[PDB]
Each structure stands twice: as structure tokens, then as C-alpha cells.
Write a protein that binds this ligand. Sequence first.
Ligand SMILES: [K+]
Ligand SMILES: [K+]
Ligand SMILES: [K+]
Ligand SMILES: [K+]
Ligand SMILES: [K+]
Ligand SMILES: [K+]
Ligand SMILES: [K+]
Ligand SMILES: [Mg+2]
Ligand SMILES: [Mg+2]
Ligand SMILES: [Mg+2]
Ligand SMILES: [Mg+2]
Ligand SMILES: [Mg+2]
Ligand SMILES: [Mg+2]
Ligand SMILES: [Mg+2]
Ligand SMILES: [Mg+2]
Ligand SMILES: [Mg+2]
Ligand SMILES: [Mg+2]
Ligand SMILES: [Mg+2]
Ligand SMILES: [Mg+2]
Ligand SMILES: [Mg+2]
Ligand SMILES: [Mg+2]
Ligand SMILES: [Mg+2]
Ligand SMILES: [Mg+2]
Ligand SMILES: [Mg+2]
Ligand SMILES: [Mg+2]
Ligand SMILES: [Mg+2]
Ligand SMILES: [Mg+2]
Lengths: 16, 81, 132, 327, 49, 567, 101, 50, 128
Amino acid sequence: YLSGEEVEEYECYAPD
Amino acid sequence: PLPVRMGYPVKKGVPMAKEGNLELLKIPNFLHLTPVAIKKHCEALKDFCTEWPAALDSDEKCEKHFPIEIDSTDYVSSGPS
Amino acid sequence: KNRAARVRVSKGDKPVTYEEAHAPHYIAHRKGWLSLHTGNLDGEDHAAERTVEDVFLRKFMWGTFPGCLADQLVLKRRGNQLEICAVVLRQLSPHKYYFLVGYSETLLSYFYKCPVRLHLQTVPSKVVYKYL
Amino acid sequence: AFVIPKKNVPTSKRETYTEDFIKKQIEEFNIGKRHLANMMGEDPETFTQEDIDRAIAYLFPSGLFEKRARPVMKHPEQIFPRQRAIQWGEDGRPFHYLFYTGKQSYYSLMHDVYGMLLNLEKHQVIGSRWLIKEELEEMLVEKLSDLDYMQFIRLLEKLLTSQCGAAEEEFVQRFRRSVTLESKKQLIEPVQYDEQGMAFSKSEGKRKTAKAEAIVYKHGSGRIKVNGIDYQLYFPITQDREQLMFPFHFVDRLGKHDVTCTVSGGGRSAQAGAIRLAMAKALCSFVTEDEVEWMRQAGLLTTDPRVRERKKPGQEGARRKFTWKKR
Amino acid sequence: NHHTYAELMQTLRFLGLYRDEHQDFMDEQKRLKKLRGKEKPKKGEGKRA
Amino acid sequence: VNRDTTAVPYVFQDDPYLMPASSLESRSFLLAKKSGENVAKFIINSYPKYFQKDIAEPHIPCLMPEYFEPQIKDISEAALKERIELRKVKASVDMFDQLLQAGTTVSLETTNSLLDLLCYYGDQEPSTDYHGVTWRAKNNAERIFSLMPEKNEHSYCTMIRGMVKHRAYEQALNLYTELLNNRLHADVYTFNALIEATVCAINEKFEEKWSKILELLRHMVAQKVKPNLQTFNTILKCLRRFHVFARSPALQVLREMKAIGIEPSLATYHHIIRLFDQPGDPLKRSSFIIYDIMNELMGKRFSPKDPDDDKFFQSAMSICSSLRDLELAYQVHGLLKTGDNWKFIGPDQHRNFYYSKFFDLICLMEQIDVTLKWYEDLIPSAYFPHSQTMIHLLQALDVANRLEVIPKIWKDSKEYGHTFRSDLREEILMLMARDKHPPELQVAFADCAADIKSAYESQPIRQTAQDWPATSLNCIAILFLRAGRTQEAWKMLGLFRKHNKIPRSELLNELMDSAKVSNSPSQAIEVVELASAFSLPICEGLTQRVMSDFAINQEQKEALSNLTALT
Amino acid sequence: HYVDWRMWRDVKRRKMAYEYADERLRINSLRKNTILPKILQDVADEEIAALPRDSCPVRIRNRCVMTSRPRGVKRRWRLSRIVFRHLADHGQLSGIQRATW
Amino acid sequence: LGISIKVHEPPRKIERFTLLQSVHIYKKHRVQYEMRTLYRCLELEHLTGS
Amino acid sequence: SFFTKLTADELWKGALAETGAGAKKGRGKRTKKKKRKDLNRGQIIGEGRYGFLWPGLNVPLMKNGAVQTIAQRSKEEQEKVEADMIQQREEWDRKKKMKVKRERGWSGNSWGGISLGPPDPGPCGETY
RNA sequence: GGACCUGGCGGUGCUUCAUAUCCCUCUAGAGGAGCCUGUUCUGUAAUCGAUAAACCCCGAUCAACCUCACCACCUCUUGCUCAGCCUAUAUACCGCCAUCUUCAGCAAACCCUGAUGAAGGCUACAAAGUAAGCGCAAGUACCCACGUAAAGACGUUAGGUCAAGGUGUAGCCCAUGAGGUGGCAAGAAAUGGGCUACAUUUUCUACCCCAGAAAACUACGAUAGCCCUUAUGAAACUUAAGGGUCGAAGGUGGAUUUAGC
Ligand SMILES: [K+]
Ligand SMILES: [K+]
Ligand SMILES: [K+]
Ligand SMILES: [K+]
Ligand SMILES: [K+]
Ligand SMILES: [K+]
Ligand SMILES: [K+]
Ligand SMILES: [Mg+2]
Ligand SMILES: [Mg+2]
Ligand SMILES: [Mg+2]
Ligand SMILES: [Mg+2]
Ligand SMILES: [Mg+2]
Ligand SMILES: [Mg+2]
Ligand SMILES: [Mg+2]
Ligand SMILES: [Mg+2]
Ligand SMILES: [Mg+2]
Ligand SMILES: [Mg+2]
Ligand SMILES: [Mg+2]
Ligand SMILES: [Mg+2]
Ligand SMILES: [Mg+2]
Ligand SMILES: [Mg+2]
Ligand SMILES: [Mg+2]
Ligand SMILES: [Mg+2]
Ligand SMILES: [Mg+2]
Ligand SMILES: [Mg+2]
Ligand SMILES: [Mg+2]
Ligand SMILES: [Mg+2]
């Protein structure tokens, strides 16, 4: 815990 | 275009919808063999058929004219061979 | 306690599919078979060969569509035709799905010497039957 | 300030079907109903739910033993579980004065029944049963304890014992469900006639793996033929012959009927048992209704369900276990 | 023909068309064993010489 | 069974995520699938031992690996023939040189079979999976030919055909002279190439070129050689350059074909169609050439005879659009639909050109009730529309006074890859906001304008500054007001200042009517404040309207006085 | 690439037995009758005994094709009980289900 | 197609077999599997080869 | 053998040993613990050792308006790709190694005094 | 050290209990004889695992060679494998299971009580509990709604299996790997399970239930021993089947003990 815990939209037809 | 559902439902649930439904994908469906299709298919296959002799009305009459009977069996299985 | 093909109860956070949620005793009762062929019918031959082929096709498709399969494969054999029905995700671009279908259909057709077709159904996410 | 890992995913919870959802589910069912009728070449107007079930079974054949797991295209009303409506408005005020009991529907019923018992005081079986808890829990659309069910029934019975009027009779009848009783009366086979005009009846019987079919003639001298053989030649064991005697002796008709029966499968005793049942069922056509009921009560018209039990793996027999090894 | 299957899928893995998760697992375990000093010796140059 | 109109072509995966959503994806999805097939075949042929177990009964020859390498390593004639069948140009030449240096005899039939390979590919290697004029001056074909000891008619013929194929027109004519000096007779296939060389060798006037060709044809009659279909197809294909000069000569070739007994193919009319379809007024001649060509082709099933047979329908439709004749277009499409004539449409580029010109002519000259039946039958079943056909479709709805379909055209346009086409979104908004409509329609037009607005807001050019045309902003705002979504309209007024787009006069007047209904003086001043920024003349007159119409608070009156000071 | 060395020995035994089947069949026919002279049958005894040991088909073992387990194998599917069940219990063997009756 | 057809259902066949449940020992504990083969017989009469 | 291979989930469940009598009662302690790693994370479909360039899978399908053909990276060009992927793997590990440290409490090993942040927002859009 | 709580245990109380069930009661057995087979011990140059209930015809629905993992001897070294290991660790594991279970409980998330102590949370004329989920149940299979199967959570025994396979850690790499030839697996004994018997409700023959003979040292009784033949196989004093010869213990079995509604 003190060390740290770092596990770490629009849509279109015919996108490009 | 059918709201068909399949799957044993959970408690207070409903059978799973068709989208992503593996149980419906597992079925050998007959959507290509609707009664309308079968009747249209058989209208096209009549030109390929021949007429059974009218004289051969009964099994006894067939035996008289055709005394020999030949039995053969064809086997339809799934696989490459 | 029986273990075979049983996803065990947890804290209610594990999503399972309809297939994963049913133990073996529910086969033919609540869930069907993932492969359909004639080899296991009475008086039929070549069950051993159909079984090895199915085990391969499942591994081949898992590694050919890595991370894309959203459920088990459904394998269908009619005559000499082999149909592979897969539920896939919508992450890979469609061009890559067409490449892998063309590649996989041709490669498997030459491997097993039969016409092979692959049918893909896409889902936005893994379909969840229940949370165990 | 710092972050704690989140406990769970909100999607991992039970879903609910809003009234708007059901309204659109019904519109899909009506459009799909016309598609399905078009698929089968049937008139969409006269397409019933029985036709839908038949068409879905053809198009999507499923052999799963459990019918609930098979394809189903039913009306959303049947498919989706009934949902209790909101119990308060926009201002947050509950609609029912017993809302805060948590069982407004159950306690509203108890209040209505208790009030009726009061008004009576101020004023002053075979074919019906009480509904079960699972049926009361649906009339109310609420969850009920086992004792809650008892208290409600104890209160209705206390209402029947009183001089309940017509208004107090339609109410109790809402919670009475008709109980259908199957008739134990034996079915009488039709009396047929042969080429020579002799009346006879025919029936069948099963004992273990033996299956018998007996033809009992209305008139005769007491001859019994089993597969074309005299019964005493076919059944040399005295007990097997006694079984053939039992039906006729019980109704006092020894030497009055001729029988020709055929039996296959099973052993000598199972065949005699199968013939006994076959002759008894056919004999019921030539005796009075009271005599047929006496044969039923004598065990002469009941198929014996006692069949060989399967052996289970890991044990010597159907029941015997392997020796518990000495310790 | 276990040769055909193993050799075919190994060839497809080197071609980038098949992902062998098992082999990837073995490749990661073998990589971390070198960093840990537990490397396979050269034939003829084993601990016994 | 007939074509399914709701589905994309069968070659595509029948899945909403994998179905092509545009003409670009329609082409690219098939190329990606074909690429996978090539990658699979490349692996199958590179590692054949993995694919040699034949478990199929009956045997399937077409599912076995191919072996492109010679298995005879001896140096002899029978080993050269192997490298010629595999089309190994370099190996066959090396094997032929070594075989020749050793002094062994190489047959004539085999020496010719080597020329056919070099003369066809031009001493170059055919394309493989993975390892101007093209008649190379230093070419193995010419060398082997010279070293050749005995030369027959077939040897010269394959040399003449290869030169013309690779554009060595001048050399092929020079070689045709030796063949005659050597008292040899050429074949029809050689003559076909010589007709092509006579026209393409040098640039001259038509009369000079037309006299040489007639000299070749007469020579073909002296040598008892019968012309085939390609002989006449090459003449008509080569006369395309001269256009008007070759129009009557070209029709003399067609009449000759009918008499001789050679039957014109689709290519024979494609070349005639292109020859008469020169830029200009087609009514003078092109009208009765295409009308007579279709009466002849009426109800005829076609078989492949010429490589250019898959270009007639693309050529014929191109004239129907130019003539603006819809009765002729139906006959052309009717011919395409008889029997198996649909297979002569051509590659994907020819299929999309034919259907674009065909459907665009329907929208123009056909009733709107029928136009919308073709729109459903063709799109997306037969082809994905270009954005210019969506516009041609909207122009057809406008002329028919059927604007309730506009929200459908936008929904379909998005599904075909036209979400972010500027000419299209502007057209849709202009038609929707051109005139006022009943409240039911106006509400529908405002639900689409919102969806279009979202398209402008979420463009994929968002990395670049958003281009909001002036017409689009004015139309989107007007549609909200007329629908009663005034809150959305008032918010949008900021975007006129952010993008510096001039507000339209109509929009400003309708905003006042929405203010007088709400009796909001501040909003009314906000309108006069906007028009004041752009210095519109109507503003000064509008300020007078605002004064009388709305109660002006002392702060508001000073605010107007501030704008009056600007005035 | 076979599961283990024991499967590889069986693979080689099956290949050699296939190659000598015709030769062994013919020699055995001479030994399995009372028609030919004993002098000829005694020589045939030596001839079939001199063939390679792994040509003898009784040395072939039906091992699980996926795990090489030498016992608990079902001939129809050529799998050990453990492997068969894993496939059967996941519904991947067409038509095979748990038996209750 | 105008062919005379009769249908019946021959009796089904169920093939059952037993396997050990555990990987090791525990002989008395088994898992039993079955294959069910169902039949339908279409009987056509008086039809030509075509 | 190809048929004896298992999936990544099966292999990690075994190798990690998170279920067992050791992990039931914490009978086994973990100063050195096997950590699960996703080996498909940085892997690109179509990329193999031989360095083949498959049009439509790992390289663009069309280049200059024309369909690309099968190609293979040069030995030098492939070494760079391999080296670049190894560096990306240490960079990924280095990013995970760089985790923000939290302040200690009353002592280095004590929980007392450590902040847990604000309470979670209540169901009715309540915040703290 | 004081007080309290939990668990364990009590040659601990009371009450009700177990249905093939703890005792008696009912039927057939085991415990005695021979043989078959497992294990133990002993023996051998010569595997391994299971081994109180919950091991002991168990992994094996199976060992003459092979199988094989063992012993002796000889041989090979980038090796059928982008090697290999049936080497160690089941107290690192997945996988598949035993056991209670011939059970009915487990429990997320909340809420309240005890001064906000470890802890506790039920009263139906009800007094703080509400609970998703899992199991039971329901349903399904088989011949019914019965029965039998199947199912049976969590947890218990660091239960069994690294030798099904896979695999973490550690170890071998001219050897703890690979191949060849031959060979081991016996019984002085003890013990578990089973088979056949000791007979007259029997023995033999005919028959498949109206018979004729047998019936105590030529009876009943070996599936054992010995000899021969045959079958399978390349290989059989060895495995199985059959015939001949032989005719033993055994005369219904102490304490104790198994199964069945
Ligand atoms: K205690
Ligand atoms: K005893
Ligand atoms: K375990
Ligand atoms: K293991
Ligand atoms: K290990
Ligand atoms: K060794
Ligand atoms: K015993
Ligand atoms: Mg018994
Ligand atoms: Mg064997
Ligand atoms: Mg069990
Ligand atoms: Mg410190
Ligand atoms: Mg004893
Ligand atoms: Mg042992
Ligand atoms: Mg031990
Ligand atoms: Mg142990
Ligand atoms: Mg123990
Ligand atoms: Mg041995
Ligand atoms: Mg070893
Ligand atoms: Mg353990
Ligand atoms: Mg029941
Ligand atoms: Mg059970
Ligand atoms: Mg149950
Ligand atoms: Mg232990
Ligand atoms: Mg040996
Ligand atoms: Mg004997
Ligand atoms: Mg012999
Ligand atoms: Mg005797």
C-alpha cells in the first residue's frame, strides 16, 4: 500500500 | 426477424435473447426449408421426375412382370471420405 | 465433490456465459453439443478422426483469432462440408476479420481436404448469463 | 486523501424491465408474429399462439429434455416476470396507506377481511380447496412467510363459519381454487362381434417384461387358449393356473367364457400375471358396474409397476453393497 | 501425425498467424530463468566434466 | 430464389459489424479476404509436406499443394519441355543454351514452344507469390530466333504476335515482310496483330491507315485465311481514334460480319458504341445507333467470345444517361437481366459505374413512387451509392413534394459512409429549412438537424478546426425555432461569433418572433446585439422594432443607445 | 513431437508392422495348416522368427493419442478415460451425454 | 412430387458405458455416459429411378 | 506435442497456486510470489519471427492506391523490430515500477494515521 | 495474574432420536476348508502409487514379449521434437476426485444490539433483522406425481493423484536422457475380498417343472495338481478352452463381523 497501487466514445459508420 | 429466445432462465429471469445466443447457434435450423420454399423447390424438380407405369398398380402385378428384386444400400455420413 | 466443468461459486463478481454456467449433467437437458456429426451414432464409423479434428480446430481458432472469440465454437458437418460458427468480439478491425476468414478457410480446406466455411457473429461484449 | 479499490462492478446486479421496455417488446412480438406467419405461408390474422409454437418447433428443432430450455417465441406478457409498479409518486408520497408496513397488499387484505367479520357481528369442500402460498403470493404480487399464509387462511375459515352473505361469498371464492378429482372408475372396453356373430371384448396387460393380449368371449365353456395351447399345458405350474382362475372366480363366472390370449416376453410367472390383467380388463365388459368396482378394489385391474431395478456402479446389486472391508 | 500438427503450428507461429499461448508461457519462464542464473548448460560442458 | 434486397452481396460476412458500410469498404473488404487466401496458398505451397495427407474420398485434386519447381535435373530435350510448361523463362533459356552448346538436337516443336513462352512474356519472369515499350532490345527471343536452324510458319507467327503484344509495332511489320519473302503463309492470329500494328505503328490520317488495313484484309483472302471475331473487333477497337472519320467505315465492318457469318458479340457493339459516343451532340447519330443495337440484342443470351464483352453494358448505360432516355435504360437493364447476362457487367468499378448512371437516371426521369422501389432494390443489395446519387435522390424528392422522406435519406446516408460529406449535409439542411411545414413535419426535420449537428460536432477532421458552413448554421438554427426548441436555438447563436459566420436575415427575424412570444427583452437585445456586430442594415430597422415591441428597461435602453452610438 | 518416447516406440512399431504384414501373412499361412510337409513348415517357423521383433503386431499398444496413456482407453475414440471425459464433460463430443436411468 | 410415402419410428438405441471418475484409485466411484440413437424411417414405393 | 498444450488461463491458474491448502489458511507465505503477466498484451496479430508483412493483417492493405503483396523484412530490419519490442517491454515494466509512494502513518509499518480519502458518495447522489 | 469470549474436550446433564438403523428382532453371508485375487511380510540383481473410517479384483474396463516406468549387460550423444527427464516436491499447483453428504447449510452487501469490548441479532396474540447469490428444493433422465439415478454448496482431512496430461520451484544434460538383448515378479507365512463346496430344498440324465437313477472311502466335493490336445500369438512347463488322470481338505464354521425395506 505504501509502495503504491498502480494496476493501471464516439462511433461512426465506415470510420477512418 | 423473430424475437425468439432460448436458454433455461435464471430465477426471476427470461430466456436469453437471440443476440449472441450460442444455444440457438447449436440448433440445425430449418429456416431454409419453410413450407413456402419446399413447395417452390418441388415445382422446379417436377421436370426431373419420371412417371411410374400405370399397369404396375399392385405389388403382385410387379412380381408377375418383374420377378427379381435387387436390394442395395447407400450410406450418407459426415466427413471427408 | 464433483469438479468436472463446474465454475464454482464466488463472491458474485465473476461473469459466466450460458455454456460455462451448466455442469456436465445438464448436457442434452439445458445445453446442447458444441459439435454435431454422425460419427457417434449407432453403426457409424470414423468417430476417432472427427474427435481429433475437432480438438485441433478449437485450438487453431483460439490462436488464429486471439482475444476475439467470445464463446466456444460450434462445429457443424454436413456431408463433407465443415462449418465453423464463432461468436467474436468487435475489437479487431473488419479488414483483419476478413483476412483471417480468408486465410483460415483456405488453410483448413487444404489441411482436411474438404470445403470449410467460417461464419462469424459479432457481439459488443461477452454475453453474461449470470454472475457467480 | 487517497483511493480505496472499488468493491464490485455495478453491472453485477439484477436487472429490471421498465414498462416502456415491455411496450416495445410487444411491438416486436406483433411484427415477428406476422413474419413467422409469412414464413409458413399462413394467414397472419388467424395465426394463434399454438401455431407459433408449432412453427418455432419446426424451424428451431431442439431435443433438450427440459422444455424451458428450448426455443420460445411467446408474448412478452408471459415471458417477462410480473413487476410491481412504483409505490410512490413524484412528490415521494406512497399511494397506499399501508406502504410503510412493507406488505401493503397482504395487510390490506387482512384489514379488509377483519373489517368484514366486524360487520357480521353488528348484523348478527369436496370440489374446492384453499389456494397455496405460491398462488396467494401471486394474487398479492408480494413475498409471504409460511405463518403469514396460515394466518390468512385461519381468518377465512373464521369467515365461513359465520353467517356470511352473498357479498362475503364472492370474496372467499376468489381464494378458492377448484380441485379436479380423477375418477377411479374402470374404463369398459367396447363389445365387438366376430364373423360368426359371437360377442367378445379385447384388452391388454403388462407384468414386468411380459405383455399379454386377451380376447374374452361373452359366452363359452371355460376354455382358455394361450398362444394356441391349453392353459394347463402352457402353464404346468399350479400357481400360474391359479392366477388365470382369480379374475373369473372373483366374479363367479368359472365355466362361462372362452378366452384366446397371446403373451410374449418375461418368465412363466410374469406371463401369468400379464394374462391375469388382460383377462380381467376384458372381462369387465360382461359384468355389472358394481362388479367392476369390486375387481378394482381387489387389485385385479391395476398394472403392477414393480419392475427390475437397475444395478448401480460401485455396488454388488440394485441395493446390496460390496462388503465393507474389515478394518 | 503429431509431427505434422506440431511442425505446422510452429511454422504458423513463426509466420505470425498463430499465437501459441502455451509456448509464450514457456518462453517467459525460460527467459526469467536465465536472469535467475538457472540456464541450460552446453552439451559436454555440464556441471560434471 | 431471387436477390435479397435487405442484404449485402453474398461474398461479405452477414453480420452488422462485418458488413461493408460503404463502396470503399465493399472493395477493401474483399481485397483483405483475398489477401488471406493468398497468404494461405503461399504457406501451403511453401510448406507442402504439411498439406499432403489426403483423407478425402473421392480425391480432390484442387485441394492439394502445387509444385512449381522442375523435378528433372538431367540436361536433355525432355527436361527443357518441363521448364517450358512451368513457364520458367530464364531456366528454359539456360537449359536451351547449355543443350545447344553440347551439340544435342533440339526439336522444332520444342524450339517453337520456347518462343511462345518468351514472346508472350517478353523474356521476363511471370509474377509469383513471393521469392512505354517492353520489347527489350536485348531479348532472348530474338537471339534464339536467329540462331534457330530451321524456321517454320509457326516460328514467325509467334514472333510477330509477341512483338505487337509488347508494342514493338514497327519490328513486327518488318518481320511480316520476311515471312512473305520466304513464301510462307501467316494465320489469322498473326493477322489480328498486324492490323493492330498498322494503326499504331505511325500517326497518319485516316485515309492512309484505312487503305493499309484493307490491304491486309485482301492479303488475308489471298492466303486462304478466314477472319475470326477478333479480326473485326481489332479493326473497330483501333478505329476509336479517328472518331467521326471512322463512323461510316466502322459500320461497314459490322455489315460485313453479319454477311460472312461471324456473329457480333457484346464487344463488337461496345467498340461501335464508344466510337459513335464522341463528345458532342449525341442526338444526331448516337440516338439511332443505340436504338438499333438494342433491338438486335433484344432477348439474346450471350456467351464469352471476346475479352471486351464485359464492357458493353457499362458503355450502353453511359449513353442512356447522356440522352436522358429512361425507356432505353430499361431495355439495357432488361438485356442484363435475361438468363445469365448479368455476369457481363464487369469488375467492381464497372458495376458501380453502371448502377450509378442507371439509378441517377431513374431519380431524374422516373416517378418518385417507382424511384423509391429501385432505391430499395439496388441499394445496398446491388451497389453502395456515391454521395452524388444521394443528392440526385433528394432533388427527386423535392421535385415530387415528398419531404417526409428526408429523415430516412439521412439515416441511410450515414449507413453508406456519407456521414461527413459536406455537399450532402448542406443539401439536406437547405431542403429541410427552405420553407415552413406543418408542425408534425417540422418536428421531424428538427430531430434530423440535431443528428446532423452532431455530425458536424464529432467530425473525424476534428483535429483540424471544425468547418461549420454559414448555410448549415443558419438552417440548423431555423429548424429548432420552427420546431419550438428555442432553448437549443438560442445556445447556437454563440457559434456565429466563435466561427465568425454571418447570420441570415430570416434567422434574425424568426428569433424576434420567439422573443415577443416569451416577452423576454434581454434575448431581443441579444439579437440586436448580434446583428450589430456584423453591421447589418436590417439591424438599425430592427432596433426600431425592438423598441416598440418590447418594454425597454433603463439598462436595456442604454444598451440600445450604445448600439445606437455605433450606428 | 509425439507425446512421449513410449508413444514414439509404438509409432515405429505400427509403421514396421504395416510394412511386414504381407510377408508375415504369407509365411504364417504356410505354418497354419496340416497339408504341407513338416520339413517345409519347420523352415517357415525359422523364417517368420527371423523377422524384426517390432514387426510383430502383438507388440502394438493402443495408447491414448493425446496423452499416451496405455490403459483406460476407449477404442472407438482412441482416448484415455481422463481425456474422453474432459471433452465429453464440456459438450464437445457429438451426441455423448451423462447416463441416468 | 407425387410420391407415396409412409413413415414410422423404429425403436431407439441407447449405448451406455462406465468410466472411472477419479484420475487415481477410488474404483467404486464411476461416471456413466450414453449415446442415444433415434430413428425415423421414410418408406417410399412405386417410384422410378429418375 | 501440440495436443498437450493448454491455454494461458489454465497455465497461470496452475503456476500461481492461488487456490489450495496453502492459500486456504495462508499456510504458505509469499516473500517471493509468482506474479501473473499478460503475454498477449504487447503482441500484434500478424507479427512473427520471420518478419513477414501480411497485407491487411499487420501492414496496410493498399499502398499508393494499389494492393500490397507479400513481403518479408530484411534480417537487419527485423533485428530492429525485435530490439524495439524488447525495449518496449522494459519500458512497460519500468512504468509499472514507477508507482507513487504514499506517506506513512504513526510509524512505517503502522496503519494508524493513514488517510483513506473521503467517504464514498451515497446512493442518492450524496457526496462527502 | 484477574475477568470474560470462542473452540476443543468431558469415564458431561436432560429430552427427542437414527429405519436396513446404534442395540435386539428378520434373511442371506464373512470369520473354519480348498481354490481365485489383493495387500503385508519375507525373498530377489530387479519398479511405482493407494495403504483407519475414506487402502487392500485399488490406478489396471487387466503385466508371457510389448505394455515398462524396474534389474544386469552393451550401445548412442544437438539426440522422434527450435531436445529430453515416469528426477525431487500432491506441504507450490491446475486438472479429476474421496470424505462427512444416508448433510442443509454457506454468504456478498446493509441494518441494529452490547457504553461502538471480544461478540450477538429469535419469540407469529412475534421482542431487529433485511438479504442478492450458491446448495437443498424445483425441474429433467429412466417405466408415473412413486422409486432409482443424477445432483449435492461452503467447509473438514496441507485427504489421493507431479506415474493421465500440463505445470511452479529445485536438480540431471557423455546422463537422473535415449536405444538394444536377456531377466525379475517367488512363498516360510500372516491377512483382506471373492469363487466353489461341505449335499437330500441334494447329485446325474431326460425335460425345461406329473420322470428315471444316484445317494458315504467307486457318494457329495477342485475352476487345484499331474498328463495330453486345441485356440491366440513370432514366441505358451507359463495364457485360456477342452479331455484324461487324480477324488484331497471340507461334514455348515469361536470371539467377531458384512449387506438388504
Ligand atoms: K464449550
Ligand atoms: K463362513
Ligand atoms: K488437490
Ligand atoms: K502431474
Ligand atoms: K513438477
Ligand atoms: K536413461
Ligand atoms: K472370503
Ligand atoms: Mg443379489
Ligand atoms: Mg497387448
Ligand atoms: Mg461422488
Ligand atoms: Mg520502516
Ligand atoms: Mg476363509
Ligand atoms: Mg506394491
Ligand atoms: Mg507408499
Ligand atoms: Mg502419498
Ligand atoms: Mg487415510
Ligand atoms: Mg515385461
Ligand atoms: Mg527415466
Ligand atoms: Mg493434498
Ligand atoms: Mg421424483
Ligand atoms: Mg449418486
Ligand atoms: Mg436436487
Ligand atoms: Mg499429504
Ligand atoms: Mg525387456
Ligand atoms: Mg482339473
Ligand atoms: Mg501354435
Ligand atoms: Mg465322485
